[PDB]
Amino acid sequence: RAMADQARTIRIPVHMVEVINKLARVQRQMLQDLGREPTPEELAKELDMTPEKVIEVQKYGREPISLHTPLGEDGDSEFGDLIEDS
DNA sequence: CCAGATCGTGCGACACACCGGGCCAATTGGCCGATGCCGTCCCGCGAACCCCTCTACCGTGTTGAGCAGCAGCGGCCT
Numbered sequence: 001r002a003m004a005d006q007a008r009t010i011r012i013p014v015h016m017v018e019v020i021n022k023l024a025r026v027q028r029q030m031l032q033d034l035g036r037e038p039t040p041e042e043l044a045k046e047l048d049m050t051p052e053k054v055i056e057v058q059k060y061g062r063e064p065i066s067l068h069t070p071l072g073e074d075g076d077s078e079f080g081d082l083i084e085d086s
Numbered sequence: 087c088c089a090g091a092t093c094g095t096g097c098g099a100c101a102c103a104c105c106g107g108g109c110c111a112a113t114t115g116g117c118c119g120a121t122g123c124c125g126t127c128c129c130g131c132g133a134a135c136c137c138c139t140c141t142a143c144c145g146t147g148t149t150g151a152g153c154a155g156c157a158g159c160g161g162c163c164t
Binding site for chain 2: 013014015016
């Protein structure tokens with residue numbers, strides 16, 4: 001429960017985290033057994049949900065990048081120095 | 087040289103100048119009054135949405151350089 005509540009900067013409810021974990025485990029097992037990357041339809045029929053829900057669950061789980069990652073070869077610039085204030 | 091262009095002059099027409107009359111066309115544009123469809127809101131139920139709780143074979147360990155301060159030790163001094 002604690003890892004479900006204190007593991008992501010953008011918090012997700014417990015049930016959505018459980019769904020994400022289930023989808024990740026199913027995808028890993030399918031990739032291992034089949035030998036190829038499962039398509040969204042294969043997971044959708046395996047997980048008993050629409051492909052839109054599958055892609056939404058995949059999208060929700062991503063980790064934000066950091067603005068301080070250096071991209072200058074000499075070590076002077078940062079990823080956050082090239083973002084325009086829209 | 088002398089005859090038409092130019093202009094003087096004259097008569098008329100006359101396109102309006104007036105400033106005043108006496109009615110009218112077109113053309114209203116308001117919403118008058120009457121009729122009708124849409125915005126807002128107040129439920130009504132239901133799908134989902136998030137939070138909390140509990141499961142008892144048992145199970146017991148994660149480079150170089152420069153400058154400055156501190157710890158250990160050799161050796162007086164009492």
